[PDB]
């Protein structure tokens, strides 16, 4: 959990312009969060990047979890192996606004982070899931009380997010 160079937004929320895959390799975190869907099919966005960085080990483990336990619910999570990226991967399902899901469940999705004293995470329901990323950061700040280190790949979004907090 060697986190450094994050902007400290609040007492417990940190943000950095970084690829979550590269941060995970650098930081060696206890927990990396996946922006998952309910059947843990890691096809695109953050999930695709994390799975490809494990050379599909995450997808094989995820398929076994689903076969045995069935799909997650929106706002839910499970803990699986972090493989080479982290000790654990917390797979968290935020609502997919682009596929017509409800923004109230974004708070429930972020509540899962409170089970872990420190996490490396993406912004939930952002990118291809279609939520306003600045709203997602506000929900994170209001909901998560443990130490969350947010990786935002796109420097422009990072600067927009920091500006919404500082200006
Ligand atoms: O820049 C990117 O492509 C993604 C976009 C994103 C933010 N939240 C998500 C939730 C689900 C799907 C996509 C997104 N953001 C990233 N942030 C940090 N590291 C990353 N590695 C790959 C994408 C990415």
Author numbering: 4 to 170
The authors write:
For CoVs, the conserved macrodomain is encoded within non-structural protein 3 (nsp3) and is called Mac1. Mac1 binds to and removes ADP-ribose from protein, countering host PARPs. Much like macrodomains that had been discovered from species such as archaea, the viral macrodomains form an αβα sandwich-like structure with several β-sheets surrounded by α-helices on both sides, with a highly defined ADP-ribose binding pocket. Furthermore, as Mac1 is completely conserved across all CoVs and is vital for viral pathogenesis, it could be a unique therapeutic target for SARS-CoV-2 and other potential pandemic CoVs.
Using a series of amino acid-based 7H-pyrrolo[2,3-d] pyrimidines, we previously created compound 4a (S), derived from tryptophan, that inhibited SARS-CoV-2 Mac1 binding to ADP-ribose with a 6.1 μM IC50 value. 4a also inhibited Mac1 enzyme activity and bound to Mac1, as demonstrated by a thermal shift profile similar to Mac1’s natural ligand, ADP-ribose. We solved the structure of 4a with Mac1 and refined it to 1.1 Å resolution. In this structure, some of the key features are a hydrogen bond with D22 and the backbone of I23, multiple hydrogen bonds between the carboxylate with neighboring water molecules, and finally a hydrogen bond between the indole NH and L126. F156, previously seen to form pi-stacking interactions with ADP-ribose and inhibitors, has considerable flexibility, and although it is next to the pyrrolo-pyrimidine and contributes to hydrophobic interactions, the geometry does not allow pi-stacking interactions. Structural visualization highlights compound 4a binding within the protein pocket, forming hydrogen bonds and hydrophobic interactions with residues D22, F156, D157, and others. Pyrrolo-pyrimidine-based compounds are promising candidates as Mac1 inhibitors due to their molecular mimicry of adenine, which enables them to fit effectively into the ADP-ribose binding pocket of Mac1. Compounds 4a/4b have a negatively charged carboxylic acid moiety at physiological pH, which we hypothesized might preclude its ability to cross cellular membranes. Based on the co-crystal structure of 4a and the docking model of 4b, the esterification could create some steric clash with the pyrimidine in the active conformation binding to Mac1.
